[PDB]
Amino acid sequence: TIPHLAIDPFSLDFFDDPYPDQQTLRDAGPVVYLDKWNVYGVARYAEVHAVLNDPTTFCSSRGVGLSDFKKEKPWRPPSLILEADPPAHTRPRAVLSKVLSPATMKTIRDGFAAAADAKVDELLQRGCIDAIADLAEAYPLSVFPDAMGLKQEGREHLLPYAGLVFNAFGPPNELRQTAIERSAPHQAYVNEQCQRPNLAPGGFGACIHAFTDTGEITPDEAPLLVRSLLSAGLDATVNGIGAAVYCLARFPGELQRLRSDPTLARNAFEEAVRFESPVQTFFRTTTREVELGGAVIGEGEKVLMFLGSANRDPRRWSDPDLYDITRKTSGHVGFGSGVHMCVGQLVARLEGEVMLSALARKVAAIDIDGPVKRRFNNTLRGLESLPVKLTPA
Ligand code: HEM
Ligand SMILES: CCc1ccc(C(=O)O)cc1
Ligand SMILES: [Cl-]
């Protein structure tokens, strides 16, 4: 039997402090019904992991937001990777895996690390900075658009466009409808940059187009795959890095452990992804009647997965509410799991690692120094402003 809850997981009060409500969602049962939006929800680790790894029943081709593409028109042409199922998903996924491959990371690591080192030294000269605007946003903006091969003109549209994308996965609340209304200039900029002439040879975007020669994607598929990287490739990392700084500012003991062994930087970042889960939620749509955790669900139903809750589920994690940079993080679902698991995870971890490495080697303390402000988004968890004082090592 399935409990009905009135919790709105897309309300500002929920975003402001989701953790009590997430425990209510977990402890009510393995599967809940959210009467506010007429969707099923799973918030425990086991069921979230199971849904993610059962793509033939919990599909993505009817949308991974609230909207069902079989019932409503998508606000933009469907993503060829995020909003596709196998087999259509497979070859586009392979292209992005190769574009963002381990081999590709060799070509960008030195510049990504150099930019992170320089940014931290720059911020140490200022002393008191906003870790969002001046760090979590500034650093990805300084490396990722260039790595994409984007021209300089128009980059002001990148973060607004991503904010729209992530709000649009949500329900038709004020956040979503404000985001979609008059979004055309953002869409126009992105869609134009996805065309082959506008992408610098050697960058991620041009490499996507180069794979049209192989038969893995057609030329008309390449712009939409560039669009995927321009949708996901900046804003999630902004909130991942901001999350990591927020954790280190709140857990000084863990900053000191990181200073003691900067080779913990990569796992310190992975733990931040688990702890904050910058990508909080995604939907699936059932392709058939299915039973889940003892409960039954009909065909064509939306299922909301609480990734952040799964990453704090005490059934799976010891001390889930503690930030522990030596935690064995493998198994967390902050990057997803299964056939859709973050194809950009090597870029994300690269940025996160080298920024936390720079902090580890250069900073002695991070003290919150002014009002903290949360940024509200139907899908992304993160801060709008994080004023901190950095003390040099
Ligand atoms: C901390 C940073 C990031 C987080 C937390 C994150 C989170 C996620 C999650 C949870 C999914 C699963 C989607 C699903 O199961 O429906 C995903 C997929 C995806 N991500 Fe990431 N992401 C991050 C960074 C990036 C970056 C840097 C890129 C590109 C450069 C990227 C591109 C993608 C793409 C294209 C997909 C779709 C993969 C597929 O459907 O096969 N993401 N991401
Ligand atoms: C990081 C979540 C995300 C993944 C993929 C897309 C896309 O394909 O547009 C958009 C967002
Ligand atoms: Cl678009």
Side-chain angles (χ1 to χ4, degrees), residues 52 60 64 79-84 89 93 96 100 144 148 166 204 225 228-241 269 273 277-279 281-284 305 307 333-349 351 380:
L52 285 167
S60 297
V64 296
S79 172
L80 303 178
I81 176 171
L82 180 72
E83 291 156 346
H89 166 261
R93 167 73 185 212
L96 291 186
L100 306 175
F144 181 79
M148 284 297 306
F166 282 99
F204 298 160
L225 285 183
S228 289
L229 302 197
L230 299 179
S231 299
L234 194 63
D235 212 359
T237 55
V238 169
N239 289 280
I241 298 174
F269 182 72
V273 176
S277 292
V279 179
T281 47
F282 269 122
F283 293 84
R284 298 293 193 255
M305 302 171 295
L307 307 176
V333 292
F335 286 119
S337 181
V339 307
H340 290 273
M341 189 181 179
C342 183
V343 71
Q345 61 188 35
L346 303 187
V347 177
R349 293 177 178 142
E351 294 182 18
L380 293 169

Short mmCIF file of all heavy atoms in Angstrom, two decimals, residues 52 60 64 79-84 89 93 96 100 144 148 166 204 225 228-241 269 273 277-279 281-284 305 307 333-349 351 380, ligand 1:
data_model
loop_
_atom_site.label_atom_id
_atom_site.label_comp_id
_atom_site.label_asym_id
_atom_site.label_seq_id
_atom_site.Cartn_x
_atom_site.Cartn_y
_atom_site.Cartn_z
N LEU A 52 17.09 3.56 -11.67
CA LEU A 52 18.10 4.03 -12.62
C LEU A 52 18.62 2.90 -13.50
O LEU A 52 18.96 3.13 -14.67
CB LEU A 52 19.26 4.67 -11.86
CG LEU A 52 19.00 6.06 -11.28
CD1 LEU A 52 20.10 6.45 -10.31
CD2 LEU A 52 18.89 7.06 -12.42
N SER A 60 13.47 7.00 -20.40
CA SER A 60 13.84 8.41 -20.48
C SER A 60 13.31 9.10 -21.73
O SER A 60 13.31 10.33 -21.78
CB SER A 60 15.38 8.54 -20.45
OG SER A 60 15.91 8.06 -19.23
N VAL A 64 12.69 13.30 -18.85
CA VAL A 64 13.19 13.09 -17.50
C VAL A 64 12.81 14.23 -16.58
O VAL A 64 13.31 14.32 -15.45
CB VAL A 64 14.71 12.86 -17.50
CG1 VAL A 64 15.05 11.58 -18.26
CG2 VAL A 64 15.43 14.06 -18.09
N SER A 79 16.54 15.96 -26.21
CA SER A 79 17.94 15.59 -26.20
C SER A 79 18.10 14.20 -26.80
O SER A 79 17.38 13.26 -26.44
CB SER A 79 18.49 15.60 -24.78
OG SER A 79 19.81 15.07 -24.74
N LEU A 80 19.06 14.06 -27.72
CA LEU A 80 19.35 12.77 -28.33
C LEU A 80 20.03 11.80 -27.39
O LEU A 80 20.19 10.63 -27.75
CB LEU A 80 20.23 12.97 -29.57
CG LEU A 80 19.67 13.90 -30.63
CD1 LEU A 80 20.66 14.03 -31.77
CD2 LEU A 80 18.33 13.40 -31.14
N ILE A 81 20.46 12.24 -26.21
CA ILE A 81 21.12 11.34 -25.27
C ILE A 81 20.31 11.28 -23.97
O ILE A 81 19.85 10.20 -23.59
CB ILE A 81 22.59 11.76 -25.05
CG1 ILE A 81 23.24 10.88 -23.99
CG2 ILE A 81 22.73 13.25 -24.70
CD1 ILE A 81 24.74 11.06 -23.85
N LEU A 82 20.07 12.41 -23.31
CA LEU A 82 19.41 12.38 -22.01
C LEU A 82 17.96 11.90 -22.13
O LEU A 82 17.45 11.25 -21.22
CB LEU A 82 19.44 13.76 -21.36
CG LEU A 82 18.77 13.88 -19.99
CD1 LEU A 82 19.58 13.19 -18.90
CD2 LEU A 82 18.57 15.34 -19.64
N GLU A 83 17.30 12.22 -23.24
CA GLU A 83 15.88 11.94 -23.42
C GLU A 83 15.67 10.89 -24.50
O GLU A 83 14.71 10.94 -25.28
CB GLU A 83 15.13 13.24 -23.72
CG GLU A 83 15.09 14.19 -22.50
CD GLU A 83 14.89 15.67 -22.85
OE1 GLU A 83 15.04 16.05 -24.03
OE2 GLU A 83 14.58 16.45 -21.93
N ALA A 84 16.57 9.91 -24.55
CA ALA A 84 16.49 8.80 -25.48
C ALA A 84 16.74 7.50 -24.72
O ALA A 84 17.44 7.48 -23.71
CB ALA A 84 17.51 8.93 -26.61
N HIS A 89 19.78 5.68 -28.04
CA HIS A 89 20.70 6.36 -27.13
C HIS A 89 22.15 5.99 -27.41
O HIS A 89 23.05 6.81 -27.20
CB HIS A 89 20.28 6.01 -25.70
CG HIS A 89 21.29 6.35 -24.65
ND1 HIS A 89 22.16 5.42 -24.11
CD2 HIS A 89 21.53 7.51 -23.98
CE1 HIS A 89 22.90 5.99 -23.18
NE2 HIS A 89 22.54 7.26 -23.08
N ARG A 93 25.56 8.40 -27.36
CA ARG A 93 26.29 8.27 -26.11
C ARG A 93 27.76 7.92 -26.36
O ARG A 93 28.66 8.47 -25.71
CB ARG A 93 25.63 7.19 -25.24
CG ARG A 93 26.43 6.72 -24.04
CD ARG A 93 26.46 7.74 -22.95
NE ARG A 93 27.33 7.33 -21.85
CZ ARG A 93 27.14 7.64 -20.58
NH1 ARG A 93 26.09 8.36 -20.21
NH2 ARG A 93 28.00 7.22 -19.66
N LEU A 96 29.75 10.99 -27.34
CA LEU A 96 30.10 11.86 -26.23
C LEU A 96 31.11 11.21 -25.30
O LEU A 96 31.97 11.91 -24.74
CB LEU A 96 28.85 12.28 -25.45
CG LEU A 96 27.91 13.23 -26.19
CD1 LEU A 96 26.80 13.69 -25.25
CD2 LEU A 96 28.63 14.44 -26.78
N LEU A 100 34.65 13.07 -24.61
CA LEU A 100 34.98 13.40 -23.23
C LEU A 100 35.72 12.24 -22.56
O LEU A 100 35.54 11.97 -21.37
CB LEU A 100 33.72 13.76 -22.45
CG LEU A 100 32.87 14.86 -23.09
CD1 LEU A 100 31.57 15.05 -22.29
CD2 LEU A 100 33.64 16.17 -23.20
N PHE A 144 35.75 26.01 -19.39
CA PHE A 144 34.86 25.09 -20.12
C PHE A 144 34.39 25.66 -21.45
O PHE A 144 34.40 24.94 -22.46
CB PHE A 144 33.65 24.70 -19.26
CG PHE A 144 32.73 23.73 -19.96
CD1 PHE A 144 33.04 22.39 -20.02
CD2 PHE A 144 31.55 24.18 -20.55
CE1 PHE A 144 32.19 21.49 -20.66
CE2 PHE A 144 30.70 23.30 -21.19
CZ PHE A 144 31.02 21.95 -21.25
N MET A 148 35.09 23.84 -25.02
CA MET A 148 34.05 23.60 -26.02
C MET A 148 34.42 24.16 -27.38
O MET A 148 33.86 23.71 -28.39
CB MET A 148 32.74 24.26 -25.58
CG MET A 148 31.97 23.55 -24.49
SD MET A 148 31.40 21.89 -24.93
CE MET A 148 30.50 22.20 -26.46
N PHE A 166 17.48 23.44 -16.46
CA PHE A 166 17.30 22.68 -15.23
C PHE A 166 15.99 23.02 -14.55
O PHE A 166 15.36 22.13 -13.96
CB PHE A 166 18.50 22.91 -14.29
CG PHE A 166 19.72 22.12 -14.68
CD1 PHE A 166 20.75 22.71 -15.40
CD2 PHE A 166 19.82 20.78 -14.35
CE1 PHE A 166 21.88 21.98 -15.76
CE2 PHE A 166 20.94 20.04 -14.71
CZ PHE A 166 21.97 20.65 -15.42
N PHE A 204 35.59 20.53 -27.91
CA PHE A 204 34.60 19.46 -27.77
C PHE A 204 33.55 19.54 -28.86
O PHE A 204 33.12 18.51 -29.39
CB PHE A 204 33.90 19.54 -26.41
CG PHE A 204 34.81 19.37 -25.22
CD1 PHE A 204 34.41 19.82 -23.97
CD2 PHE A 204 36.05 18.76 -25.33
CE1 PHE A 204 35.22 19.67 -22.86
CE2 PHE A 204 36.86 18.60 -24.22
CZ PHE A 204 36.45 19.06 -22.98
N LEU A 225 23.87 17.26 -30.01
CA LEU A 225 24.82 16.74 -29.03
C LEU A 225 25.71 17.84 -28.47
O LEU A 225 26.01 17.85 -27.27
CB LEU A 225 25.65 15.60 -29.63
CG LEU A 225 24.93 14.26 -29.79
CD1 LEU A 225 25.91 13.23 -30.33
CD2 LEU A 225 24.31 13.75 -28.49
N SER A 228 23.68 19.36 -25.80
CA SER A 228 23.73 18.65 -24.53
C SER A 228 24.89 19.14 -23.66
O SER A 228 24.72 19.33 -22.45
CB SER A 228 23.84 17.15 -24.76
OG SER A 228 22.63 16.63 -25.27
N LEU A 229 26.08 19.30 -24.24
CA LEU A 229 27.21 19.76 -23.45
C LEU A 229 27.03 21.20 -23.00
O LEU A 229 27.48 21.57 -21.91
CB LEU A 229 28.52 19.64 -24.25
CG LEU A 229 28.90 18.24 -24.76
CD1 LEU A 229 30.38 18.20 -25.16
CD2 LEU A 229 28.58 17.14 -23.75
N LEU A 230 26.38 22.03 -23.81
CA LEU A 230 26.12 23.40 -23.41
C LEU A 230 24.95 23.51 -22.45
O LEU A 230 24.75 24.58 -21.86
CB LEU A 230 25.85 24.28 -24.63
CG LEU A 230 27.02 24.37 -25.62
CD1 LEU A 230 26.64 25.23 -26.81
CD2 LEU A 230 28.27 24.90 -24.95
N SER A 231 24.18 22.44 -22.28
CA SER A 231 23.10 22.42 -21.29
C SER A 231 23.60 21.96 -19.94
O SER A 231 23.31 22.58 -18.91
CB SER A 231 21.97 21.51 -21.76
OG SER A 231 21.41 21.94 -22.98
N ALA A 232 24.36 20.87 -19.93
CA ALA A 232 24.80 20.21 -18.70
C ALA A 232 26.19 20.61 -18.25
O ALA A 232 26.51 20.47 -17.07
CB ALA A 232 24.77 18.69 -18.90
N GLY A 233 27.03 21.09 -19.17
CA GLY A 233 28.47 21.08 -18.95
C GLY A 233 29.02 22.16 -18.05
O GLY A 233 30.17 22.05 -17.62
N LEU A 234 28.24 23.19 -17.75
CA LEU A 234 28.69 24.31 -16.93
C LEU A 234 27.99 24.37 -15.58
O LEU A 234 28.65 24.36 -14.53
CB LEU A 234 28.48 25.62 -17.71
CG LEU A 234 29.15 26.89 -17.22
CD1 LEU A 234 30.66 26.76 -17.27
CD2 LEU A 234 28.70 28.07 -18.06
N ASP A 235 26.65 24.38 -15.57
CA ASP A 235 25.91 24.71 -14.35
C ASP A 235 26.04 23.62 -13.30
O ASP A 235 26.14 23.92 -12.10
CB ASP A 235 24.44 24.95 -14.71
CG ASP A 235 23.77 25.98 -13.84
OD1 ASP A 235 24.41 26.52 -12.91
OD2 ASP A 235 22.57 26.24 -14.08
N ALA A 236 26.04 22.35 -13.71
CA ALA A 236 26.21 21.29 -12.72
C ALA A 236 27.57 21.39 -12.04
O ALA A 236 27.67 21.25 -10.82
CB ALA A 236 26.02 19.92 -13.38
N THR A 237 28.63 21.67 -12.81
CA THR A 237 29.95 21.83 -12.20
C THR A 237 30.03 23.08 -11.33
O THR A 237 30.70 23.06 -10.29
CB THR A 237 31.06 21.84 -13.27
OG1 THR A 237 30.80 22.86 -14.25
CG2 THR A 237 31.15 20.51 -13.96
N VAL A 238 29.35 24.17 -11.71
CA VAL A 238 29.29 25.34 -10.84
C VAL A 238 28.79 24.94 -9.46
O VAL A 238 29.38 25.28 -8.43
CB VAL A 238 28.40 26.44 -11.45
CG1 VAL A 238 28.11 27.54 -10.43
CG2 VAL A 238 29.05 27.04 -12.68
N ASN A 239 27.67 24.22 -9.42
CA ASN A 239 27.10 23.85 -8.14
C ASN A 239 27.88 22.74 -7.45
O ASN A 239 27.88 22.66 -6.22
CB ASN A 239 25.64 23.47 -8.33
CG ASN A 239 24.80 24.68 -8.65
OD1 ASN A 239 24.44 25.43 -7.76
ND2 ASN A 239 24.53 24.91 -9.92
N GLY A 240 28.57 21.89 -8.22
CA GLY A 240 29.44 20.91 -7.60
C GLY A 240 30.61 21.55 -6.88
O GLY A 240 30.92 21.21 -5.74
N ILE A 241 31.27 22.50 -7.55
CA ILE A 241 32.41 23.18 -6.94
C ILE A 241 31.95 24.06 -5.78
O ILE A 241 32.58 24.09 -4.71
CB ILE A 241 33.17 23.99 -8.00
CG1 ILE A 241 33.72 23.04 -9.07
CG2 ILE A 241 34.29 24.82 -7.37
CD1 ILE A 241 34.37 23.72 -10.26
N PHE A 269 36.10 15.95 -3.67
CA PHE A 269 35.09 16.47 -4.58
C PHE A 269 33.95 15.46 -4.75
O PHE A 269 32.78 15.84 -4.76
CB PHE A 269 35.71 16.81 -5.93
CG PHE A 269 34.74 17.39 -6.90
CD1 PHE A 269 34.25 18.67 -6.73
CD2 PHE A 269 34.29 16.65 -7.99
CE1 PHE A 269 33.35 19.21 -7.61
CE2 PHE A 269 33.38 17.19 -8.87
CZ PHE A 269 32.91 18.48 -8.68
N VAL A 273 29.87 15.90 -4.09
CA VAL A 273 28.77 15.56 -4.98
C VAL A 273 27.75 14.70 -4.26
O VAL A 273 26.53 14.91 -4.38
CB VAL A 273 29.29 14.88 -6.27
CG1 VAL A 273 28.14 14.44 -7.16
CG2 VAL A 273 30.19 15.84 -7.01
N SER A 277 24.72 16.78 -3.58
CA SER A 277 23.97 16.28 -4.73
C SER A 277 23.44 17.46 -5.54
O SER A 277 22.23 17.71 -5.57
CB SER A 277 22.87 15.35 -4.27
OG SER A 277 23.43 14.16 -3.74
N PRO A 278 24.33 18.19 -6.21
CA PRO A 278 23.91 19.37 -6.98
C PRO A 278 22.80 19.09 -7.96
O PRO A 278 21.96 19.97 -8.20
CB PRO A 278 25.20 19.81 -7.68
CG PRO A 278 26.22 18.76 -7.40
CD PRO A 278 25.79 18.02 -6.20
N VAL A 279 22.75 17.90 -8.55
CA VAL A 279 21.61 17.49 -9.35
C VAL A 279 20.73 16.65 -8.44
O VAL A 279 21.04 15.50 -8.13
CB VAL A 279 22.02 16.72 -10.61
CG1 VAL A 279 20.79 16.30 -11.41
CG2 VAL A 279 22.96 17.57 -11.47
N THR A 281 17.35 15.68 -8.55
CA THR A 281 16.22 14.87 -8.97
C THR A 281 16.23 14.67 -10.48
O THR A 281 16.68 15.54 -11.24
CB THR A 281 14.89 15.53 -8.60
OG1 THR A 281 14.91 16.91 -8.98
CG2 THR A 281 14.60 15.40 -7.11
N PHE A 282 15.71 13.52 -10.90
CA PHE A 282 15.28 13.31 -12.28
C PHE A 282 14.06 12.40 -12.26
O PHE A 282 13.83 11.65 -11.30
CB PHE A 282 16.39 12.70 -13.16
CG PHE A 282 17.25 13.74 -13.85
CD1 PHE A 282 18.62 13.76 -13.64
CD2 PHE A 282 16.69 14.67 -14.69
CE1 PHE A 282 19.42 14.70 -14.27
CE2 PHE A 282 17.48 15.62 -15.33
CZ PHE A 282 18.84 15.64 -15.12
N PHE A 283 13.27 12.48 -13.32
CA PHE A 283 12.10 11.64 -13.53
C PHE A 283 12.42 10.50 -14.50
O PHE A 283 13.34 10.58 -15.32
CB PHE A 283 10.92 12.43 -14.09
CG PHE A 283 10.33 13.45 -13.16
CD1 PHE A 283 10.89 14.72 -13.07
CD2 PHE A 283 9.19 13.17 -12.42
CE1 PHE A 283 10.34 15.67 -12.23
CE2 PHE A 283 8.64 14.12 -11.57
CZ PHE A 283 9.20 15.37 -11.49
N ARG A 284 11.62 9.45 -14.39
CA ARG A 284 11.46 8.43 -15.41
C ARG A 284 9.96 8.26 -15.66
O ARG A 284 9.13 8.71 -14.87
CB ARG A 284 12.10 7.10 -14.99
CG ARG A 284 13.60 7.15 -14.76
CD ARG A 284 14.35 7.41 -16.04
NE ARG A 284 15.80 7.18 -15.92
CZ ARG A 284 16.72 8.13 -15.84
NH1 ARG A 284 16.39 9.42 -15.86
NH2 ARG A 284 18.01 7.80 -15.77
N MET A 305 12.82 10.43 -8.93
CA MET A 305 13.93 9.87 -8.18
C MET A 305 14.61 10.99 -7.40
O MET A 305 15.03 11.99 -7.99
CB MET A 305 14.95 9.20 -9.11
CG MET A 305 14.40 8.08 -9.98
SD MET A 305 15.62 7.57 -11.21
CE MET A 305 15.75 9.06 -12.19
N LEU A 307 17.72 11.80 -5.96
CA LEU A 307 19.13 11.40 -5.92
C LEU A 307 19.80 11.90 -4.65
O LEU A 307 20.57 11.16 -4.02
CB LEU A 307 19.85 11.95 -7.16
CG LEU A 307 19.26 11.63 -8.53
CD1 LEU A 307 20.06 12.33 -9.61
CD2 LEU A 307 19.21 10.12 -8.78
N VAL A 333 24.77 8.19 -6.27
CA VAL A 333 24.02 8.41 -7.50
C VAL A 333 23.99 9.89 -7.89
O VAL A 333 23.13 10.31 -8.65
CB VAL A 333 22.59 7.84 -7.38
CG1 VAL A 333 22.63 6.32 -7.30
CG2 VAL A 333 21.86 8.43 -6.16
N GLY A 334 24.92 10.69 -7.36
CA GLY A 334 24.98 12.09 -7.73
C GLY A 334 25.31 12.32 -9.20
O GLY A 334 25.00 13.38 -9.74
N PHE A 335 25.96 11.35 -9.85
CA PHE A 335 26.17 11.35 -11.29
C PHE A 335 25.22 10.40 -12.01
O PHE A 335 25.41 10.12 -13.20
CB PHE A 335 27.62 10.95 -11.62
CG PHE A 335 28.64 12.03 -11.34
CD1 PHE A 335 29.66 11.81 -10.43
CD2 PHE A 335 28.59 13.24 -12.01
CE1 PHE A 335 30.61 12.79 -10.18
CE2 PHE A 335 29.53 14.22 -11.76
CZ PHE A 335 30.54 13.99 -10.84
N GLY A 336 24.20 9.90 -11.33
CA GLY A 336 23.35 8.89 -11.92
C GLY A 336 23.95 7.50 -11.75
O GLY A 336 24.86 7.26 -10.95
N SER A 337 23.43 6.58 -12.55
CA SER A 337 23.85 5.19 -12.50
C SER A 337 23.24 4.46 -13.68
O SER A 337 22.08 4.70 -14.03
CB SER A 337 23.41 4.52 -11.19
OG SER A 337 23.84 3.17 -11.14
N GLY A 338 24.02 3.59 -14.31
CA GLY A 338 23.52 2.81 -15.41
C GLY A 338 23.79 3.44 -16.76
O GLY A 338 24.78 4.16 -16.93
N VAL A 339 22.91 3.19 -17.73
CA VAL A 339 23.24 3.55 -19.11
C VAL A 339 23.35 5.06 -19.29
O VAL A 339 24.03 5.51 -20.21
CB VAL A 339 22.22 2.95 -20.10
CG1 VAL A 339 22.09 1.45 -19.87
CG2 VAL A 339 20.88 3.63 -19.99
N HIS A 340 22.72 5.86 -18.43
CA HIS A 340 22.75 7.31 -18.57
C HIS A 340 23.72 7.98 -17.62
O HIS A 340 23.75 9.21 -17.55
CB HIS A 340 21.35 7.91 -18.36
CG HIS A 340 20.38 7.61 -19.46
ND1 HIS A 340 20.27 8.39 -20.59
CD2 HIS A 340 19.46 6.63 -19.58
CE1 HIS A 340 19.32 7.90 -21.37
NE2 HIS A 340 18.81 6.83 -20.78
N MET A 341 24.50 7.21 -16.87
CA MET A 341 25.39 7.80 -15.88
C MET A 341 26.25 8.87 -16.53
O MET A 341 26.78 8.68 -17.63
CB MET A 341 26.28 6.74 -15.24
CG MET A 341 27.07 7.30 -14.05
SD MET A 341 28.13 6.06 -13.29
CE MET A 341 28.91 7.04 -12.01
N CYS A 342 26.39 10.00 -15.83
CA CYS A 342 26.99 11.21 -16.37
C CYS A 342 28.11 10.93 -17.36
O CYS A 342 29.19 10.46 -16.97
CB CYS A 342 27.54 12.07 -15.24
SG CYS A 342 28.21 13.60 -15.86
N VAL A 343 27.89 11.24 -18.64
CA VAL A 343 28.94 11.06 -19.62
C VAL A 343 30.02 12.12 -19.49
O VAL A 343 31.11 11.96 -20.03
CB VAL A 343 28.34 11.05 -21.04
CG1 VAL A 343 27.87 12.45 -21.43
CG2 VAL A 343 29.35 10.52 -22.04
N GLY A 344 29.74 13.22 -18.78
CA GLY A 344 30.73 14.25 -18.59
C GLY A 344 31.44 14.15 -17.26
O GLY A 344 32.08 15.11 -16.82
N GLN A 345 31.37 12.99 -16.61
CA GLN A 345 31.87 12.91 -15.24
C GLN A 345 33.38 13.09 -15.17
O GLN A 345 33.86 13.54 -14.13
CB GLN A 345 31.45 11.59 -14.59
CG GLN A 345 31.95 10.33 -15.25
CD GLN A 345 31.33 9.09 -14.65
OE1 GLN A 345 30.16 9.10 -14.26
NE2 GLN A 345 32.09 8.01 -14.57
N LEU A 346 34.12 12.81 -16.24
CA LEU A 346 35.57 13.02 -16.19
C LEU A 346 35.91 14.51 -16.25
O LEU A 346 36.85 14.95 -15.59
CB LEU A 346 36.26 12.26 -17.33
CG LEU A 346 36.00 10.76 -17.37
CD1 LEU A 346 36.87 10.12 -18.44
CD2 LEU A 346 36.23 10.11 -16.02
N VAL A 347 35.15 15.29 -17.02
CA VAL A 347 35.34 16.74 -17.02
C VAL A 347 34.99 17.31 -15.65
O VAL A 347 35.73 18.13 -15.09
CB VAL A 347 34.49 17.39 -18.13
CG1 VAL A 347 34.63 18.90 -18.09
CG2 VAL A 347 34.88 16.85 -19.50
N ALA A 348 33.85 16.89 -15.10
CA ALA A 348 33.41 17.39 -13.80
C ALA A 348 34.45 17.09 -12.72
O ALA A 348 34.84 17.97 -11.95
CB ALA A 348 32.06 16.78 -13.43
N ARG A 349 34.88 15.83 -12.64
CA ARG A 349 35.87 15.45 -11.65
C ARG A 349 37.20 16.16 -11.88
O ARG A 349 37.91 16.50 -10.93
CB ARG A 349 36.07 13.94 -11.65
CG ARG A 349 34.89 13.17 -11.17
CD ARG A 349 35.13 11.67 -11.27
NE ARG A 349 33.97 10.96 -10.75
CZ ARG A 349 33.48 9.83 -11.25
NH1 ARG A 349 34.04 9.26 -12.32
NH2 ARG A 349 32.40 9.29 -10.70
N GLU A 351 37.70 19.24 -13.17
CA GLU A 351 37.54 20.59 -12.63
C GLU A 351 37.51 20.57 -11.11
O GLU A 351 38.17 21.38 -10.46
CB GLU A 351 36.26 21.24 -13.16
CG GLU A 351 36.25 21.50 -14.64
CD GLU A 351 34.97 22.19 -15.09
OE1 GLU A 351 34.25 22.75 -14.23
OE2 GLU A 351 34.67 22.16 -16.30
N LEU A 380 18.50 21.85 -9.61
CA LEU A 380 19.84 22.09 -9.07
C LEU A 380 19.76 22.59 -7.63
O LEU A 380 18.94 23.45 -7.31
CB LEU A 380 20.61 23.11 -9.91
CG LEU A 380 20.99 22.72 -11.33
CD1 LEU A 380 21.49 23.94 -12.06
CD2 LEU A 380 22.05 21.61 -11.33
C1 HEM B 1 29.26 17.94 -10.68
C2 HEM B 1 28.88 17.97 -11.96
C3 HEM B 1 27.77 17.10 -12.59
C4 HEM B 1 26.77 16.41 -12.03
C5 HEM B 1 26.36 16.29 -10.54
C6 HEM B 1 26.03 15.75 -13.08
C7 HEM B 1 24.92 14.96 -12.92
C8 HEM B 1 24.37 14.14 -13.88
C9 HEM B 1 23.36 13.13 -13.67
C10 HEM B 1 22.70 12.81 -12.32
C11 HEM B 1 23.08 12.56 -14.84
C12 HEM B 1 22.07 11.40 -15.05
C13 HEM B 1 20.88 11.76 -15.92
C14 HEM B 1 19.83 10.68 -15.89
O1 HEM B 1 20.07 9.57 -15.34
O2 HEM B 1 18.73 10.93 -16.42
C15 HEM B 1 23.93 13.17 -15.86
C16 HEM B 1 23.97 12.89 -17.21
C17 HEM B 1 24.62 13.65 -18.17
N1 HEM B 1 25.59 14.62 -17.95
FE1 HEM B 1 26.30 15.15 -16.09
N2 HEM B 1 26.63 16.05 -14.28
C18 HEM B 1 27.70 16.87 -14.03
C19 HEM B 1 28.56 17.39 -14.99
C20 HEM B 1 28.48 17.26 -16.35
C21 HEM B 1 29.41 17.78 -17.33
C22 HEM B 1 30.65 18.61 -16.91
C23 HEM B 1 28.96 17.45 -18.57
C24 HEM B 1 29.54 17.73 -19.98
C25 HEM B 1 30.73 18.29 -20.24
C26 HEM B 1 27.75 16.67 -18.38
C27 HEM B 1 26.96 16.12 -19.37
C28 HEM B 1 25.99 15.14 -19.17
C29 HEM B 1 25.24 14.46 -20.20
C30 HEM B 1 25.40 14.74 -21.71
C31 HEM B 1 24.42 13.57 -19.61
C32 HEM B 1 23.44 12.61 -20.32
C33 HEM B 1 24.11 11.25 -20.39
C34 HEM B 1 23.18 10.19 -20.91
O3 HEM B 1 21.94 10.43 -20.95
O4 HEM B 1 23.69 9.12 -21.32
N3 HEM B 1 27.49 16.58 -17.04
N4 HEM B 1 24.69 14.14 -15.22
#
